[PDB]
Amino acid sequence: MKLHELKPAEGSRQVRNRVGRGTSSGNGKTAGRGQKGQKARSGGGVRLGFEGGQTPLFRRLPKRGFTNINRKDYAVVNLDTLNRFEDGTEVTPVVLKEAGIVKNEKAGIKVLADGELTKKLTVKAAKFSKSAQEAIEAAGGSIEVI
Amino acid sequence: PKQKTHRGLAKRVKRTGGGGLKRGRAFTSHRFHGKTKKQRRQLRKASMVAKGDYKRIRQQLARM
Amino acid sequence: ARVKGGTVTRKRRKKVLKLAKGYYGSKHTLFKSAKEQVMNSYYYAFRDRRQKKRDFRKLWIARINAAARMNGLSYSKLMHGLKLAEIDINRKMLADLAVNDAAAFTALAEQAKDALSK
Amino acid sequence: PNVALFKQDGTQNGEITLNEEIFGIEPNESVVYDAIIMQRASLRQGTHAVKNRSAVRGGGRKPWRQKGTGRARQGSIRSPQWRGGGVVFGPTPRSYSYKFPKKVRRLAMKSVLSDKVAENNLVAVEGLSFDAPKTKEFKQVLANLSIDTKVLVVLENGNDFAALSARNLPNVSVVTSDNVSVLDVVSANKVLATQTALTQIEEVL
RNA sequence: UGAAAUUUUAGUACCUGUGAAGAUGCAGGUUACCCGCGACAGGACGGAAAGACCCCAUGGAGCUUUACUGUAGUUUGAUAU
RNA sequence: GGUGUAGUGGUAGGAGAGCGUUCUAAGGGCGUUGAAGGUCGAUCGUGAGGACGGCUGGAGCGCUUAGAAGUGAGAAUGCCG
RNA sequence: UAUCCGGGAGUCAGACUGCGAGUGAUAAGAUCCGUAGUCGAAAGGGAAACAGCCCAGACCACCAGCUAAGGUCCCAAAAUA
RNA sequence: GUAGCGGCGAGCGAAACGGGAAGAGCCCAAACCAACAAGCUUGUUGGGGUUGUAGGACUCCGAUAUGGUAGUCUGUUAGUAUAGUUGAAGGAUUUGGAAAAUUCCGCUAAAGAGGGUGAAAGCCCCGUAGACGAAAUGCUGACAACACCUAGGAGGAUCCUGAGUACGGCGGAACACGAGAAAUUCCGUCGGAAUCCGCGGGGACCAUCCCGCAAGGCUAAAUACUCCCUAGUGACCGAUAGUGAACCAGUACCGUGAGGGAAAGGUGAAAAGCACCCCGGAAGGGGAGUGAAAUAGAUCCUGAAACCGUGUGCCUACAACAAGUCAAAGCUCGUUAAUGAGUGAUGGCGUGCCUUUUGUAGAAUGAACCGGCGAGUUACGAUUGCAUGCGAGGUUAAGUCGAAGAGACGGAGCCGCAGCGAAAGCGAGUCUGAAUAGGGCGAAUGAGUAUGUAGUCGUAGACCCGAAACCAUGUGAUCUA
Ligand SMILES: [K+]
Ligand SMILES: [K+]
Ligand SMILES: [K+]
Ligand SMILES: [K+]
Ligand SMILES: [K+]
Ligand SMILES: [K+]
Ligand SMILES: [K+]
Ligand SMILES: [K+]
Ligand SMILES: [K+]
Ligand SMILES: [K+]
Ligand SMILES: [K+]
Ligand SMILES: [K+]
Ligand SMILES: [K+]
Ligand SMILES: [K+]
Ligand SMILES: [K+]
Ligand SMILES: [K+]
Ligand SMILES: [K+]
Ligand SMILES: [K+]
Ligand SMILES: [K+]
Ligand SMILES: [K+]
Ligand SMILES: [K+]
Ligand SMILES: [K+]
Ligand SMILES: [K+]
Ligand SMILES: [K+]
Ligand SMILES: [K+]
Ligand SMILES: [K+]
Ligand SMILES: [K+]
Ligand SMILES: [K+]
Ligand SMILES: [K+]
Ligand SMILES: [K+]
Ligand SMILES: [K+]
Ligand SMILES: [Mg+2]
Ligand SMILES: [Mg+2]
Ligand SMILES: [Mg+2]
Ligand SMILES: [Mg+2]
Ligand SMILES: [Mg+2]
Ligand SMILES: [Mg+2]
Ligand SMILES: [Mg+2]
Ligand SMILES: [Mg+2]
Ligand SMILES: [Mg+2]
Ligand SMILES: [Mg+2]
Ligand SMILES: [Mg+2]
Ligand SMILES: [Mg+2]
Ligand SMILES: [Mg+2]
Ligand SMILES: [Mg+2]
Ligand SMILES: [Mg+2]
Ligand SMILES: [Mg+2]
Ligand SMILES: [Mg+2]
Ligand SMILES: [Mg+2]
Ligand SMILES: [Mg+2]
Ligand SMILES: [Mg+2]
Ligand SMILES: [Mg+2]
Ligand SMILES: [Mg+2]
Ligand SMILES: [Mg+2]
Ligand SMILES: [Mg+2]
Ligand SMILES: [Mg+2]
Ligand SMILES: [Mg+2]
Ligand SMILES: [Mg+2]
Ligand SMILES: [Mg+2]
Ligand SMILES: [Mg+2]
Ligand SMILES: [Mg+2]
Ligand SMILES: [Mg+2]
Ligand SMILES: [Mg+2]
Ligand SMILES: [Mg+2]
Ligand SMILES: [Mg+2]
Ligand SMILES: [Mg+2]
Ligand SMILES: [Mg+2]
Ligand SMILES: [Mg+2]
Ligand SMILES: [Mg+2]
Ligand SMILES: [Mg+2]
Ligand SMILES: [Mg+2]
Ligand SMILES: [Mg+2]
Ligand SMILES: [Mg+2]
Ligand SMILES: [Mg+2]
Ligand SMILES: [Mg+2]
Ligand SMILES: [Mg+2]
Ligand SMILES: [Mg+2]
Ligand SMILES: [Mg+2]
Ligand SMILES: [Mg+2]
Ligand SMILES: [Mg+2]
Secondary structure (H helix, E strand, O other): OOOOOOOOOOOOOOOOOOOOOOOOOOOOOOOOOOOOOOOOOOOOOOOOOOOOOOOOHHHHOOOOOOOOOOOOOEEEEEHHHHOOOOOOOEEOHHHHHHHOOOOOOEOOEEEEOOOOOOOOOEEEEOEEOHHHHHHHHHOOOEEEEO | OOOOOOHHHHHHEEEOOOOOEEEOOOOOOOOHHHOOHHHHHHHHOOEEOOHHHHHHHHHHHOOO | OOOOOOOHHHHHHHHHHHHOOOOOOHHHHOHHHHHHHHHHHHHHHHHHHHHHHHHHHHHHHHHHHHHHHHOOOOHHHHHHHHHHOOOOOOHHHHHHHHHHOHHHHHHHHHHHHHHHHO | OEEOEEOOOOOEOOOEEOOHHHHOOOOOHHHHHHHHHHHHHHOOOOOOOOOOOOOOOOOOOOOOOOOOOOOOOOOOOOOOOOOOOOOOOOOOOOOOOOOOOHHHHHHHHHHHHHHHHHHOOEEEEOOOOOOOOOHHHHHHHHHHHOOOOOEEEEEOOOOHHHHHHHHOOOOEEEEEOOOOOHHHHHHOOEEEEEHHHHHHHHHHO
């Protein structure tokens, strides 16, 4: 491109709308705020979720549950992703992290049976679903709980 | 600053897979003698935040 | 990046004032009075571009009526006769004939009366 | 692609081959534009401020009582509508610089270089050697290469005599092969690069 | 010698009517040559003061008390000296 | 681009497309043979608005593309003169 | 044209007329609903003037024509039909 | 914006891990030893010793080294700050009052940053690139000197290892944590330990396990800020702006005082600032001069509008006028040459602008007029549209290098690719349930993410102006009681 012939991509940039700049622009005078009221005042408006005094929805609804301090979440992996590897390959949490499939392993890798596996593999992971273990082993592979 | 979450809502609702919010039911605290067993049974079940209510409050749970 | 008032303000107001030349005193001298008057002038101008058509049709009708009376006819009877005789000459041309070509208008009136008789 | 290689005297040697991945791509105009705008914004210093009614000097007391005087009610002599009052909003110090995705940056650089090559505005020279810095000699070098428009002279690191001898020419912009930017390439109408500089560029990209 | 309040621009009539329901300005009619000077105060809902009466604001302030919640003081006990 | 048919009052308000102001970049220009500014004119466009002459003036300023805003006033018993 | 999904609103003082009711006194330019229209946010013609009634919805130019409500002796266009 | 805290409201809101900037560790008290002094201990002095894989004393052995320092107006030396020196290259022609402008040929450049010069200068001047420079006095760094720290091994019989302390009750306070189930830290008051088989902590508490060793002290760097000084920068202001203050400004002025607080820049290139003459007492003018220009004459660049006045082309003394517009005779004049311009007898129609209202010509509100100034912005987040890049992936943050740039590195972290459940947990399913039942939420039925931009929202004064008031320092009894 040439500095004297620049052209942005169509629709990439828009013109800011300025209010209170004459009537014919469509936002003159009231600047789109309407006529009087609380919402027409500078800094006006009510806090989010406010209902003008009617009991708000969250107040109506009860609190529920608790958070387990020892909660454990696992980074999930499916058989379709495992298909990306070659037969005889040793699948490991390190292997997954290097491949970029699992950037954050959380409490560990758990393998699920969402897809159809087609390659023989020795898979090492924190956990395996029962269906996932069966699929891996039926494909001639093996599973080891790291 | 970071937009803050409404902690009361965070305690009362759950984000579902499809983006909706799961909520408990009202009238499930006491005075059960005033409600038929059908009412109690059908209030035991959870429900979803209605469209109007969600459109009012979604910004308070953006980062829930 | 300050944008001081500049000259656009003076230019715009001067356009309004020039539009207001000939008005009475402050109505041509002062921008606010001039603008308020120029707006009313626009209102009157738009309204009068329609009223002007009405005025001239009214004038032509009156002149045609006088000429028809002199030829022994009312305006209404003349126009009815002309419609019967298929004459499409409009009121502007008819009024012009009445004032300028009296003989032509009389000939038109004769045909109108003949159509009425038939 | 391939570009004629020239000796400092101006006689052309055999062509040389440039990496297609760097000089052989189809330029992406929109990406180039984004890079230009981003770099130009980054150059801004953004030091500009005004005093609002809180910052203006004085202006504490109420000018006159709320009622009775017959004048318009006022709160401070420094309110924005007052002559000498604070400014409503207005400039405040801030940064205009942002960052594009690395991939977009790389694409922009490749696009400008590829565009130069395609137009044949890329002049590669075997080497630029000056026993001592002399702008007259470098100007003669440009004449030998038949370059008269705006030129970006890309030198390998350490070619201080070439850099010095060229810099003062009005139409010449000197940059080291390690430090070359989309804005520099786009500004220059022609790009005069030494062969070592091109090698180092290909390594960098 | 030389101000001021006021002031949308005014070539600034009367009657009856109309109209945000009390018109110099609108309708119909009537009256009236142009410009002033000295006087009067019916009107311009005349000027002056974002009505103090009245109502409203989840306004303010001072005051009262067996309003609510505190509290300085006063007093009583334990404990240390 | 042509034809045809239909449509084009409008407050709050939504959408779209533009005019003009200052500044930045690039390109391409104009200026003591007179820039900006001021003033007059019977000029052009659908609109905001744009030219071109005469006079005044005496040194800076347009145009095209893109960018950024202290970007447009007639009203606030607004402030200053 | 309807839905459904999403971005952005404004609105929560309504007025009158006709028709159907209540309240009122089978009063109010009263009040409160239902229903249709108009005004609100609608210029034009008629009703003397006259937001809400009658006719009728202005993108523009014309010194062209036909009609609506309402009119045709003069003001004042058109029948002393 | 998680875990949490919270009239579980409004809101408040961590820390550890991980990634970086910077990095440094050391002294006492005590045991014990020697001396001193008084009154076998008990104070002073010196030695000794300094800690958790427990250390130390003490007792045995062996080494009298090895290294370090956060010391010193100790020099020697270098550099640097505070003046400076040097520093290339143009003449003509046209316009002009003046050349840097125009035109023609040149020249210089490690210097084409910038400023000034009679208009716009690479080559006229000050400069710049570059080179060079310090008697004197600071500052820094090195070198040296002086100085101060700096021991290994083996044993435990015994001794030492911080007391009105830790801790507890009561009452407060700090920890994101508002007494709460409430640890941890601190204050006041009262009570009040153990001491190596000892003690503290791991969010009440206990046991086990792990980690540590309080009640003594010191410690550079990364970090915060800029009244000042030096050198610069700016899609920052350009005289109602920018500091209140471009000017003799915290001045004038106001107030008892605290305190409040202005206005006010521009002749010309050069004063060459109008000799002399004329009217006038002067002021002020008219000539005559200076000047390119004096309608640049000091109220001095330009010189708008309101406002005031002179001259006149047309009209106006029977007319009821929101002052116009439409139609039009007459008169006058001739332009961006256009089916022109000014004025206008006369005729038709016609109750301003704004705000606020169901409705305003309104006898409802606002504006005396003119000019200037004067109101949805920015930062950080949320969300949607549009755009670009990549795509089951997307992307870096801090930080390092770099021109205050781009860019490179930096994958810690964030979003997405799996959901369901309060949770254990299970998983293309899962939860409820006795259930292979039904049903809910999901999958089948996949697009996301980084950035730009625009709309809207949240936190911030959040579009602008406006209270009566509240609170915390001060100043006032020169009036008055
Ligand atoms: K809006
Ligand atoms: K719930
Ligand atoms: K209940
Ligand atoms: K009224
Ligand atoms: K009177
Ligand atoms: K009071
Ligand atoms: K002109
Ligand atoms: K603004
Ligand atoms: K005003
Ligand atoms: K919608
Ligand atoms: K009705
Ligand atoms: K947060
Ligand atoms: K609350
Ligand atoms: K020692
Ligand atoms: K000179
Ligand atoms: K110069
Ligand atoms: K020295
Ligand atoms: K506690
Ligand atoms: K612990
Ligand atoms: K520990
Ligand atoms: K002058
Ligand atoms: K005159
Ligand atoms: K008239
Ligand atoms: K009033
Ligand atoms: K089931
Ligand atoms: K199911
Ligand atoms: K995308
Ligand atoms: K976006
Ligand atoms: K604000
Ligand atoms: K806002
Ligand atoms: K006294
Ligand atoms: Mg923008
Ligand atoms: Mg609108
Ligand atoms: Mg307005
Ligand atoms: Mg308003
Ligand atoms: Mg309202
Ligand atoms: Mg509203
Ligand atoms: Mg209530
Ligand atoms: Mg229960
Ligand atoms: Mg019931
Ligand atoms: Mg202005
Ligand atoms: Mg018609
Ligand atoms: Mg203040
Ligand atoms: Mg007044
Ligand atoms: Mg200011
Ligand atoms: Mg009436
Ligand atoms: Mg009346
Ligand atoms: Mg009138
Ligand atoms: Mg009046
Ligand atoms: Mg009054
Ligand atoms: Mg009032
Ligand atoms: Mg229409
Ligand atoms: Mg300018
Ligand atoms: Mg502005
Ligand atoms: Mg004004
Ligand atoms: Mg009523
Ligand atoms: Mg309304
Ligand atoms: Mg109407
Ligand atoms: Mg109206
Ligand atoms: Mg007809
Ligand atoms: Mg007639
Ligand atoms: Mg008859
Ligand atoms: Mg020199
Ligand atoms: Mg020259
Ligand atoms: Mg606390
Ligand atoms: Mg205690
Ligand atoms: Mg404890
Ligand atoms: Mg340990
Ligand atoms: Mg430190
Ligand atoms: Mg100032
Ligand atoms: Mg000025
Ligand atoms: Mg000031
Ligand atoms: Mg002059
Ligand atoms: Mg002047
Ligand atoms: Mg008469
Ligand atoms: Mg007369
Ligand atoms: Mg009212
Ligand atoms: Mg007024
Ligand atoms: Mg005193
Ligand atoms: Mg005294």
